[PDB]
Design a protein around this ligand. Sequence first.
Ligand SMILES: *[C@@H]1O[C@H](CO)[C@@H](O[C@H]2O[C@H](C)[C@@H](N[C@H]3C=C(CO)[C@@H](O)[C@H](O)[C@H]3O)[C@H](O)[C@H]2O)[C@H](O)[C@H]1O
Ligand SMILES: *[C@@H]1O[C@H](CO)[C@@H](O[C@H]2O[C@H](C)[C@@H](N[C@H]3C=C(CO)[C@@H](O)[C@H](O)[C@H]3O)[C@H](O)[C@H]2O)[C@H](O)[C@H]1O
Ligand SMILES: [Ca+2]
Ligand SMILES: [Ca+2]
Ligand SMILES: [Mg+2]
Ligand SMILES: [Mg+2]
Lengths: 515, 515
Amino acid sequence: VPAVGEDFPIDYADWLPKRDPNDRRRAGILLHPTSFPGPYGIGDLGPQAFKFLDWLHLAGCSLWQVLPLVPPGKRGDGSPYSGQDANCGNTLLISLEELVDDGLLKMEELPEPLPTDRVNYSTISEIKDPLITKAAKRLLSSEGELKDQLENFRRDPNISSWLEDAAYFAAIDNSVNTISWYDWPEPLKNRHLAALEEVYQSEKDFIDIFIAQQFLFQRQWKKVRDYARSKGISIMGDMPIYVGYHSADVWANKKQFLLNRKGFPLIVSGVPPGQLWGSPLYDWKAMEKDGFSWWVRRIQRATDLFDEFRIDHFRGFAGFWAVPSEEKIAILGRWKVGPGKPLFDAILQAVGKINIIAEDLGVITEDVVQLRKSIEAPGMAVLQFAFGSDAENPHLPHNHEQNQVVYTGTHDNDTIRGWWDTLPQEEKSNVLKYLSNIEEEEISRGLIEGAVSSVARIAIIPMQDVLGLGSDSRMNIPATQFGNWSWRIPSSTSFDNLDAEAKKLRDILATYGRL
Amino acid sequence: VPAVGEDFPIDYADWLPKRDPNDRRRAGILLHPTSFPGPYGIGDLGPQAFKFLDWLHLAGCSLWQVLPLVPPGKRGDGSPYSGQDANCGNTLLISLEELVDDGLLKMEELPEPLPTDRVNYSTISEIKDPLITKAAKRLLSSEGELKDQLENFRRDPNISSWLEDAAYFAAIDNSVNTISWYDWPEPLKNRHLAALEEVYQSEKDFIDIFIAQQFLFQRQWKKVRDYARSKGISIMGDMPIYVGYHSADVWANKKQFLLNRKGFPLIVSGVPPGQLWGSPLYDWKAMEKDGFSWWVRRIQRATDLFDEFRIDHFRGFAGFWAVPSEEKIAILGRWKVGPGKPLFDAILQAVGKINIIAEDLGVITEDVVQLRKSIEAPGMAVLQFAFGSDAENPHLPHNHEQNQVVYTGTHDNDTIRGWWDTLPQEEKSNVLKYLSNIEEEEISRGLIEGAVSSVARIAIIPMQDVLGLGSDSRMNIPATQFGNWSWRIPSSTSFDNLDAEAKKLRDILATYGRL
Ligand SMILES: *[C@@H]1O[C@H](CO)[C@@H](O[C@H]2O[C@H](C)[C@@H](N[C@H]3C=C(CO)[C@@H](O)[C@H](O)[C@H]3O)[C@H](O)[C@H]2O)[C@H](O)[C@H]1O
Ligand SMILES: *[C@@H]1O[C@H](CO)[C@@H](O[C@H]2O[C@H](C)[C@@H](N[C@H]3C=C(CO)[C@@H](O)[C@H](O)[C@H]3O)[C@H](O)[C@H]2O)[C@H](O)[C@H]1O
Ligand SMILES: [Ca+2]
Ligand SMILES: [Ca+2]
Ligand SMILES: [Mg+2]
Ligand SMILES: [Mg+2]
């Protein structure tokens, strides 16, 4: 500007305040693709994914939130948070119809329509796995555009940085079949170069098929993401802070983790009173020495899948609970100093600006708040947690801030109707008083409008709440072992029959500036 | 914290996030003391002030907002924004009952009860001025504690820095009686030291009485502020950015203003299309040279009266419209560069942390937003301005921020009921839709709850809205010449009969975390 007291330009008054596009108010739906309806026992990245994104666009939503897309471990269950690998895609999400379109499968090979209500994780692999393998084998023997794209995918330096290790790990797991790589024969456990060369010779078809399957996943997921972008929809993903011990992530990167000389975890994850989670812990001291290269690669893959993502247990970057691996419960651990902002500095330098959502629920310490504010990451508000304490409860709308994501509830919460059904009478009248004496019969509308009308720049509604569903549609009960991750949109409900639900959401998005 | 990877203390989990007392959510009432009821034609700093603060405390409010407390100029009208002086108190606010308590007036000298509905600014001075003068004369001839306190007040270096000039200015104005000091005899206009010595000799009684009156004001206002503090109530004041030409502020500080060699303004204030306000403009270049001493003294006096205060036309600190003083309308001016943050740096250095509210209504430029955010000053939201454009209207609750003050309406707005009565049908249905399909009959409750439930850390309700009053109770219609600043609480309404109104406000303060 000119000196104090001097004339501004004649056009000074045109200099109106700048709206930053990253402050745009948006609404989204939480819907894991396993939950899409269809005839093959599990939702997929096929026709229903495009039908869903058309419905979202009709509803005026500009965000779609999914759970982790990794292959769930089968040491039970279908949990997206117990993955076999941090970077691979769940091959059960591959659309059999899109592979028929590609010429990789024949109409005739498709199974007869399966029961539609719920995912049966005990049977779905045995049905789909042989068909995905058949398609992969046809791709590997093909000589067209898709073969060229497979070759470009497998030679991409970002892809090969995790996929080669993931494929060799899977080939060895299949062949040796121990509970953990801890018990592998020493040449495979300790990655003797000559032993790995022999694995490629004896397990070549397995490794090539595994890689082709990851290409088929990548190509279908990129078609979905491209379609979402064409409709102005961003995809928000999710990642656990910790990875599983029995994975290529640990076996191929042992010095990134706090293991003993035999590769057994010295300390494992959990929370004090408490909860023993049992993941191996990062050697954050050793990671700082190489510029957090392992974490940079994990974030690079996450940005390949998602526009933005949550990190579950974000508090672990500030401080983490470490339990001696011999211990069988959480009580006897210690809080350890997390890497803090220098991890996020390294990621910015290497990958540029990322939109990370900090999962910051429950008892968190001041250093977690300071770390989140230091990287300008939004935290969470969950309305189903707002009404059981006092008016300083940070989940109440009057305590929300602009740089925040508000939920009615996540995949870890009951549906609004299920939550209301088991809510104590004292807490119900509190809810109804807060939401301005609305009637018990309109509690869904009240909580959804409470989220959409928040100052929080992102509001997310689970699809179960749009469809008016009860506790029978809850995705997860934390710590329970059965009935989880299996909810599907019923076969009788089609996106083409939900125009009224889309209009009802669009009208409140318009009123509260999210459209 | 310890090094990355090392143990935290055993007590890490006790380190809960820090609530800063300056982020405390509060509610207040806007009520200028002229509006207090009583039998002497105008509200005062007497019994009704203490009755009001008891009511506020019963209502759970922790803030009281008043307009400027300066003596209104009589070149018409009662406007607190057209003051005779920036630093003096309005002697019409002096309680005649408290002076009877002090022994400075006799019961018998009190007038017979006057008409109670409205302030008559054309008659109130002629009634009260002679009585305040009588009390001042008794103080001046007295020999007790109050005489000692008067001597300590008039010798206080902060007080004397404005009061001596204010008293001499008033003595000369009374004696010479021109429309402006521009036309004073040269020795008084240009403050010849020998002419000022002669003024003290010939106008000694006037000057001593003027000073005693300012002491009587100070002492009554400090009793009110002390009582407010005892009840956990802060007082928020208000100040126009500009002062009036015909004042001690300009006459005793001519080089702080852009005047010609004869003391006539070179340029005057206003806004482009437009509005010619006609105040003299600050020489912000000359002010920076002495560390903004004049502004520091004005802020020091404001903190003597108020816990926190609004600055009206805060945008003038970034950029100001300057109209050539010969011009008779606003169109032919230029925007000039305001002093910016260095003024606020000087105030911090000299007076310490102040809580300033930025009046930032209407078309403001990006530099005004940057300046306000650079000193962490809250701006305003006014709900009566929210509903006539689109969902990006910054006055809508979903666009509010924590560091903000929300109003239903200010003294410049109609009452909620008056505003609703002249609101176009299209804007009414918009309002009712936004506030969640509430009924037209409950619009007052709806707008008050919309303010109290905001994320804005301060919510302010005019007393006219608590009392359910219509357009006949509006304090000001901007640019109009009559009927303004004269509303009083009717004689039939007493604070002791408002327990239901206090409880209704207290209950929503409890629900929305302002108690
Ligand atoms: C945030 O991340 C949570 C876990 O870190 C996730 O919790 C869900 O998924 C967990 C994997 C699950 N634990 C199961 C898996 C095991 C095998 O490694 C067992 O140790 C546990 O006893 C199993 O229950 C949690 O139960 C489950 O809530 C959240 O969903 C996610 O939001
Ligand atoms: C913010 O500040 C406003 C003015 O700066 C104030 O406006 C009210 O008070 C003004 C003094 C008034 N103008 C009158 C006074 C004059 C004598 O100097 C005339 O020039 C004008 O023509 C008069 O009308 C405004 O009309 C009035 O709105 C706001 O109230 C305050 O919030
Ligand atoms: Ca096995
Ligand atoms: Ca006069
Ligand atoms: Mg070896
Ligand atoms: Mg002279």
